[PDB]
Structures are given as C-alpha cells and as structure tokens.
Amino acid sequence: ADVAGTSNRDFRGREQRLYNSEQYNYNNSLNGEVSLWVYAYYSDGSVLVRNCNSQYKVGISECFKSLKEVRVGQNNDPYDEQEVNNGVYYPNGGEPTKFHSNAKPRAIQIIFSPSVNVHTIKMAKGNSVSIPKDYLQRSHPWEATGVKYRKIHVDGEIVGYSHYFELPHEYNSISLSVSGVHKNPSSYNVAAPHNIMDVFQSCDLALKFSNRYWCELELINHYISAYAYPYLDINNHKYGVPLNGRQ
Amino acid sequence: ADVAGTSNRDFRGREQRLYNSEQYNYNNSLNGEVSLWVYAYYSDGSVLVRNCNSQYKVGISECFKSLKEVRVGQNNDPYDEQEVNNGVYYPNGGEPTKFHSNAKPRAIQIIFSPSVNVHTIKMAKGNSVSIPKDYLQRSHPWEATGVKYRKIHVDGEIVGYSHYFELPHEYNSISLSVSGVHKNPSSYNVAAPHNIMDVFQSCDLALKFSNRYWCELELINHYISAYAYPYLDINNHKYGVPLNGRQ
Amino acid sequence: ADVAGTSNRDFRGREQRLYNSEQYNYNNSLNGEVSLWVYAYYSDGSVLVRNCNSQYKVGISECFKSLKEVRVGQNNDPYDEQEVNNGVYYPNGGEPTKFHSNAKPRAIQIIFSPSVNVHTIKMAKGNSVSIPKDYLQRSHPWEATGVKYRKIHVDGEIVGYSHYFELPHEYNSISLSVSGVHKNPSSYNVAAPHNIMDVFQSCDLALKFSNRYWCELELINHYISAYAYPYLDINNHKYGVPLNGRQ
Numbered sequence A, B, C: 001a002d003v004a005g006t007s008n009r010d011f012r013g014r015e016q017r018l019y020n021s022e023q024y025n026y027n028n029s030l031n032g033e034v035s036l037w038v039y040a041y042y043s044d045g046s047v048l049v050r051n052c053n054s055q056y057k058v059g060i061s062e063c064f065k066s067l068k069e070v071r072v073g074q075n076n077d078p079y080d081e082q083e084v085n086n087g088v089y090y091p092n093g094g095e096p097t098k099f100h101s102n103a104k105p106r107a108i109q110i111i112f113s114p115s116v117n118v119h120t121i122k123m124a125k126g127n128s129v130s131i132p133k134d135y136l137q138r139s140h141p142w143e144a145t146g147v148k149y150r151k152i153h154v155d156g157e158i159v160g161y162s163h164y165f166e167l168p169h170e171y172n173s174i175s176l177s178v179s180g181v182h183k184n185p186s187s188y189n190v191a192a193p194h195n196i197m198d199v200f201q202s203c204d205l206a207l208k209f210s211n212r213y214w215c216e217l218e219l220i221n222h223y224i225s226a227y228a229y230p231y232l233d234i235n236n237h238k239y240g241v242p243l244n245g246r247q
C-alpha cells in the first residue's frame, strides 16, 4: 500500500476528514439539532446551565425565581428567599434579612449552536414579574438581538454564537426567554403543511438539561469540553471543536 | 403659547391621549401581548397566581397537585399531602391525617387581557388524574367557555375578561388548563406559512410568572395595580386602567 | 314488550353496544384524545407515571434527573443524589456515597392510547446530559420506533400500544422524550391553516399527570383499572377495556 500522509490514497485520512465534515454538515441539515444554552453566573462562582436541544427551532423560558441559585441538598434559606422574591416583585414588598440576594444572577450568557440562523434569534429580557417592557400594553413580546451575537471562532470555524450581558446593578432583576430557529437556506418551509406536524412533535421531543456547576473551570471541563459544546469564558477564551473539512 | 386646556393647541394634552391610545391599540395589534392569569384561592385567604404572557396565543396547564397551596419555606406536611393526593386520585387510596386538605383551592378565577378573542377561549377543567370528562374515551379535550366570561369594565372600557368558579364541595378536585388566542380581525393567518415559525417561537418566548400572595388585598396592591393588570375581587369590584381615547 | 335478549327490539341492549362503540370511535375521531404514559420502574418496586392527554398530538420530555425516584415527604438524600447526578453527567465527576443510585429507573414502559398512529411515534432516548446520540453534531433528534410497539389486545381489540425496555446495566443512564400523533385517516391536515391555531391551543390545553405508586399492583388497581387505561404488567398480562361493537 501507499505510505501514510504522502499521497491521495490515504483513505484513512480522507475518511477522517469526511467523518468530521459529515457531522458539521449534518448538524446544519434540517435533520439536525439546533441547541441553546443559557448560563446564569452567581457571585459564589457557580454557574447554572439551562440547555435545550431540538430540531427546527429551540428555546428556553425562565422567570426571576427560576434563574436564582439553588444549592441542591444545602441550605437555601427558602423562606427568606421567598421574601426576597416578594421584595423584588414590588419595592418594599417583602421582609427578607438582606438587601441583595446572592442567589441573583450576576450575568447571563446565551450561546447557540452553529446551526442557528442568527436573524431568527429572539429574546424577552423582562422585569421581575415577567413583563417584557415594564407594562404589557407597551410590550413587544421579544427583541431581535442577533446583531449583538459574537461568533465563537476556533481554527477559523464558527463553532457557536454568544450574547453576554452582565447584571451588576441592584435593579438588574430579570425574567428571560430566548428562541432561535435552525438554519434553513432552502425555500422549503419546515412548518408548512407537508411537515408542520413534525415541528409540533419537535416541541414534544426537545431534550432539556439543567445543572449548577460549582465553577467555570468545572463547567468547561465536565460539560462544555466533554460534549463538544461551544463556550466563551470570562477571559474571552473560545472553546469548541472545528469540524468542517478538518481531520 | 396658548393656555392649557382651552384650545386645540394643547399638544401636551393631545400627546397624552395618543400615548394611552397607542398602548391600548398596540396591545390589540398582532405585535401585542395576549395574557392569561389563573388565580387559585385558598381557605387561609392566600392566592396563588399563575400568569403567562405571549404573542399570538397563550395558555396555562395545571394538574391537581400543582394547584395546591405551597407555603415556600414553611411547613407543608409533604408526606401527609402526598397521601392526600393518593386519596384524591382514587377514593380511599391514601392515609392522610385529614378529611379535607386546606391546600385545595376553594375557587378559581381565570382572567384574560382585553386583547383576547373570547370566542377562542378553551378550558379543560378535568378530574384529579387529569382527564377532562371522567374517562379519556368520552372526553372532548376542552370546553369553549367564552360565553361565560364577564367583561371587566372600568370607565366604560373593557380592561379584561373574567371567568370565576368556586370549588366549595368536597368533590371539587380538579386539574385545569386554559387557552386563548390573541384578537385577529384581519384575514391574515398568523400561523399560516408566512409567519408560522414565529408562532412556534412565541411558544418558546412566552414569559411565565407564579407567586402566592398572602391575601387578595396584597395581590390587588402589589401585583394587579402595580402592573396595570385587570382584576375582579370578591366584592365584585373592578380593577384596571382605561386607556383608549383617554388621558 | 319483547323479552330481554331474545329479539331485535332489545333497545337497552342496542343502546349499550352503541354507547361503547361511540366512545371507542369518538376517541379515534379528530375531536378525541391521544394519550401517552411513560412508566419508570424503580428497584424498590415503586413506579413513577408521567401522563399527558391531548388533542391532535401528545408528548412527554424528561431528563436524567427528572426520571429519578423521588419519595415525596421522605428522605431522598438530596445532596448525595446531586453528587450522583454530577458523577453520571461525567465519569468521576462527583463524590456520592454510592456506586449505583437506587433512584435510577430499572426500566421504562411507554404506552400509547389506541388512538395513536404508530407510524408517527418518535423517541429521543438520550444520554445523561440530554443528547440523543452521544454528540449533538451526529444526532438525529429522534428515532421512529413504532415497529417495536406491541399491541395490547383484550378480547381481540387493540386497547393500546406498548414499548418496553429495561435499563439493567450501570451505563443505562438516560434522558427521554416521546411523541405520538393522533390517528388521522382523512386527508384533512389538522395543522394546515384552517385549523392550525387549534393545534397550538392543544399544546396549551394538554393535561399532565404525575405520581409515584408504591408498586405495580397499586398502579394497576388505582390508576390503570380505575380510569380504563391500557397496561401490560411484568408477567405480560394485558389490561384495558374493549369497547368497539361490545356490550
């Protein structure tokens, strides 16, 4: 046989490159996943991830309470934190023993898989009682924020998209929903009658994941890297696995 | 300049009236919210609200368990109340220490924003195991109850719609889902192929809110009134903010 | 009058047969329910049921954590079980006091009502972090498993469909979503524009039920049999109520 890495008959080499290319392009096919991660960062350094993986379109919807840090199996002062909720839903509306709950997110990162079309991204960053813009009567139910999404590049390939905003002020008390649609460069509407019921089933079939990791290092190591997910850390370091045309 | 309140050149006055009119009519545009509140009233006077706010259509789905009173951070006798659940799912099916759980709702109020079309309202008021009408085989999955919805009028304007039913009998053990569609007097189908994927995204983007307020006064003060929501209290008093054509 | 059971004028007899036939065929009409049960079996003999009942289509979506046994109001070692979660999401990723959590399901049974079309059934049996097939890039978001569904026959009638798989190995750590579409032998697309918004409302109106029964006997007695649901027990015994053309 020919010698490895010296000719066009390194079929092992060609097959490796095709395997990676097939995965990248399958993901971008209408058969492929579109994935969304919402990361809530807490002052103790831990990070809640909410993930959804689905065909055609994907989303996550959270309220003020559901974004708050919960240390499973540890003390979370639930009565006091309910009083925090009451005090955040209406000024002077509760009697907690604290001014600022350390369970409040300090920041949010939204990351999409590279199979999203950024022009379809929508976000409702609402107030603490789940209104998009102060009052329902004046609220568009979303903002289209795609132009703010940064490309996560690795080795010249887009491995994902990130929108990051901090919540450093005392009044940064939010509710949050996010939605994105899978790329479709064809003119075949996946939600027209020939395929519409499959998009309804995709709403059923969407897989969700949630966990609170004790720090960003642990998240990077045992979540992001373990499962070939894209990420951007606090030092602007990019994570992900480039696949198209690559060995 | 002209003197305030004496001529057609009170532009401040005209702008105020337009601001309010724009909010009312924006809410009724296809860009606007449609909102649903389900209020569960408990014997201790507290009130659970479940709220969802979304474009195009909106709904809430609850089971017997999820409607039960939960006092966050206080004693809820969870084992005993699981035995209540077992005893309510099947007669003589549990061993709780009580005949009637005070966590059971005594009444339900359903309120829609004025941007709902009442002809589209649907409700599945089911039994304790989440069947609409005793057995699945005979169950239509909803009832269309719009004709029972009362207009909440303030200053001659419809600020919302209410359907209220008490659950005063021991056998009033329910599951509950409710759905309504945003007004659309145009013939443009928001869920036809030109816009269908946006209605799917609206399912993602819908913002939800839940809280248990200690009484109806507190609910009126720090929830309803605070956020310009419609309401009807036990004394048939109407709450809401009239906007169309008004300063 | 004629004597009972001796002539074609036993109208009581004819009405009984029609009552049962009407229920069976109503269930199969587009007005009827389609229902899904996911049963998670635990080593202590208890069984979690997740049920959804809806028009047009139905589904259930669970993650690794949500399938785990929870004994309401009893000790569940929540910190230790969070460490189990960490150790199952990534090998050697936690520090629980155990090798195998007895809260892990030992098996799953999926049962559909007889009103499902088995060709529409889809399942995403994913890994512990809610990826269908190890990595998102290579994942079709479902498998179509209808050919594996067994008919639950009683008295020669199909009363439901079952797919059952055990999880007996230590590496059988899963996430799970399932979806099925209601029979529609007509060419009228229930999700084409004439009726599409009603299918969106059906997503709102779907009723859900969850409970953990202490054993299969109790499940059979107070859940399955009580509410005329189909079932298949560990001894391959079939349960359900035959209705079509029957008294």
Ligand SMILES: Nc1nc2c(ncn2[C@@H]2O[C@H](COP(=O)(O)OP(=O)(O)OP(=O)(O)O)[C@@H](O)[C@H]2O)c(=O)[nH]1
Residues within 6 Å of the ligand: A155, A245, A246, A247
């Ligand atoms: N492209 C490129 N890579 C370099 C160079 N010098 C060092 N490198 C490293 O080599 C890596 C690329 O190697 P290859 O993947 O084999 O080269 P390639 O440009 O991708 O070409 P093919 O994969 O064969 O089509 C990069 O990730 C760099 O870190 C250079 O001059 N050009």
Ligand SMILES: Nc1nc2c(ncn2[C@@H]2O[C@H](COP(=O)(O)OP(=O)(O)OP(=O)(O)O)[C@@H](O)[C@H]2O)c(=O)[nH]1
Residues within 6 Å of the ligand: B155, B245, B246, B247
């Ligand atoms: N319309 C009306 N309001 C009265 C009358 N007497 C007292 N009011 C009070 O005045 C309020 C209405 O005042 P306005 O809003 O300035 O009058 P309007 O009828 O709405 O007329 P415009 O807003 O200028 O178009 C009502 O809410 C009443 O409580 C009356 O005779 N007619």
Ligand SMILES: Nc1nc2c(ncn2[C@@H]2O[C@H](COP(=O)(O)OP(=O)(O)OP(=O)(O)O)[C@@H](O)[C@H]2O)c(=O)[nH]1
Residues within 6 Å of the ligand: C155, C245, C246, C247
């Ligand atoms: N069909 C049938 N059933 C039998 C026979 N012997 C005993 N059985 C029992 O009788 C039951 C059926 O009785 P029926 O329902 O009155 O008879 P059928 O065949 O359904 O006929 P119709 O309901 O009158 O149309 C079955 O469930 C059997 O358990 C037999 O020879 N033929």
Ligand SMILES: Nc1ncnc2c1ncn2[C@@H]1O[C@H](COP(=O)(O)OP(=O)(O)OP(=O)(O)O)[C@@H](O)[C@H]1O
Residues within 6 Å of the ligand: A153, A154, A155, A156, A157, A238
């Ligand atoms: N020294 C080099 N000279 C020429 N091309 C390079 C070199 N290093 C990498 N490349 C190529 O440049 C392209 C972009 O790779 P690069 O490493 O810059 O991506 P990146 O990870 O986004 O970079 P960075 O994260 O440092 O901004 C790839 O096609 C890669 O093969």
Ligand SMILES: Nc1ncnc2c1ncn2[C@@H]1O[C@H](COP(=O)(O)OP(=O)(O)OP(=O)(O)O)[C@@H](O)[C@H]1O
Residues within 6 Å of the ligand: B153, B154, B155, B156, B157, B238
């Ligand atoms: N004394 C009055 N004479 C004439 N018109 C009035 C008077 N008070 C209010 N109105 C007008 O009548 C219309 C209805 O207002 P009204 O106060 O009756 O509404 P409402 O809050 O639904 O009343 P209620 O709650 O007392 O039944 C409004 O256009 C308002 O401007």
Ligand SMILES: Nc1ncnc2c1ncn2[C@@H]1O[C@H](COP(=O)(O)OP(=O)(O)OP(=O)(O)O)[C@@H](O)[C@H]1O
Residues within 6 Å of the ligand: C153, C154, C155, C156, C157, C238
């Ligand atoms: N002894 C019998 N002779 C003839 N027909 C019978 C007899 N018993 C039942 N049947 C008929 O046969 C058909 C199938 O009934 P059967 O009792 O076999 O259903 P099944 O409950 O699926 O059976 P099994 O669970 O024992 O496999 C029905 O129409 C029934 O009326």
Ligand SMILES: [Cl-]
Residues within 6 Å of the ligand: A029, A030, A031
């Ligand atoms: Cl494709």
Ligand SMILES: [Cl-]
Residues within 6 Å of the ligand: B029, B030, B031
């Ligand atoms: Cl419009």
Ligand SMILES: [Cl-]
Residues within 6 Å of the ligand: C029, C030, C031
């Ligand atoms: Cl029909």
Ligand SMILES: [Mg+2]
Residues within 6 Å of the ligand: A245, A246, A247
């Ligand atoms: Mg290369």
Ligand SMILES: [Mg+2]
Residues within 6 Å of the ligand: B245, B246, B247
């Ligand atoms: Mg006026």
Ligand SMILES: [Mg+2]
Residues within 6 Å of the ligand: C245, C246, C247
């Ligand atoms: Mg018979």
